[PDB]
């Protein structure tokens, strides 16, 4: 069955990206996905996304700009210290110039450049570039 | 596929330890059966006694007579066959002559066109066979 909601969300965004579609349904909306998409949206890879409330786990319609190469998840959510973070950088990211590893730290769901500034580790959710 | 979950280290470590046995280089270096079966006994060299000069025919398409010696070891009494490498170095060896043998290149496997022979003679009566060949020393 469905064990991981974030994985089915990012696989469906990734499949619609290479099909060249403009919009995509994301079924069940959790709050972890919403906090994941905003980090993708502040760095500007996706457009505005509409969240639909249906008195259960809702749906999200996402506008795609056409900028995304690959949004992936990492399973399990390995705990990552700041010592080991740069070894995840050259295994997930295509370059040191762009791309982000998304962490969930105690100060919230962060990309990896923000976690160095805040000096905290966390569990890894996924990545996008 | 493979289990990925965060508590599956025992399943992964034990499955690995079982599946290490299915290749040749791990199996022969950890059973000890092959260590029991080579006559060196895990050593690189051994001294023995030449019992007999033997002629070994080369595997086809090669058509020569490979000059070898039938050697009984001093360490454990195992009888082996060692090759005598060079043009006419069989004439330096006699019977009841104490030689030093070594491996022959492929770490226990048979080499070249000589069937069932995996050793070669190095020293003959405390004199290296390369020196008898080049005229450096004498018997």
């Amino acid at each position: 069955v469905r064990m991981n909601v974030l994985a089915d969300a990012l696989k469906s965004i990734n499949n619609a990206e290479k099909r060249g579609k403009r919009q995509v349904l994301i079924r069940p909306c959790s709050k972890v996905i919403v906090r994941f998409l905003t980090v993708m949206m502040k760095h500007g890879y996706i457009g505005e996304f509409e969240i639909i409330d249906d008195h259960r786990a809702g749906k999200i319609v996402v506008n795609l700009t056409g900028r995304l190469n690959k949004c992936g998840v990492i399973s399990p959510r390995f705990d990552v210290q700041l010592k080991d973070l740069e070894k995840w950088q050259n295994n997930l990211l295509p370059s040191r110039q762009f791309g982000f590893i998304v962490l969930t730290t105690s100060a919230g769901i962060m990309d990896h450049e923000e976690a160095r500034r805040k000096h905290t580790g966390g569990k890894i959710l996924g990545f996008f570039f | 596929g493979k289990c990925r979950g965060l508590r599956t280290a025992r399943k992964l470590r034990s499955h690995r330890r079982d599946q290490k046995w299915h290749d040749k280089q791990y199996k022969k270096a950890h059973l000890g059966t092959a260590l029991k079966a080579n006559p060196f006994g895990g050593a690189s060299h051994a001294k023995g006694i030449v019992l007999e000069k033997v002629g070994v025919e080369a595997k086809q398409p090669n058509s020569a007579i490979r000059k070898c010696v039938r050697v009984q070891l001093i360490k454990n009494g195992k009888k082996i066959t060692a090759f005598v490498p060079n043009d006419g170095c069989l004439n330096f060896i006699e019977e009841n002559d104490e030689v030093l043998v070594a491996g022959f290149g492929r770490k226990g496997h048979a080499v070249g066109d000589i069937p069932g022979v995996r050793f070669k003679v190095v020293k003959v009566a405390n004199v290296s066979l390369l020196a008898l060949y080049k005229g450096k020393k004498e018997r």
Partner: protein
Amino acid sequence: SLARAGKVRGQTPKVAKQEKKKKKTGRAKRRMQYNRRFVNVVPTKKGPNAN
């Protein structure tokens, strides 16, 4: 039949060596290898032991 052994090495006619000039050894031998390859830029590739 272990009779014929050392046959070709015995039937080789013996040719003594020619006592010749001492080879230079050390840094100076590398001086020759640098000169004979990178200073002689004559037009022309042929190998160095070609006959």
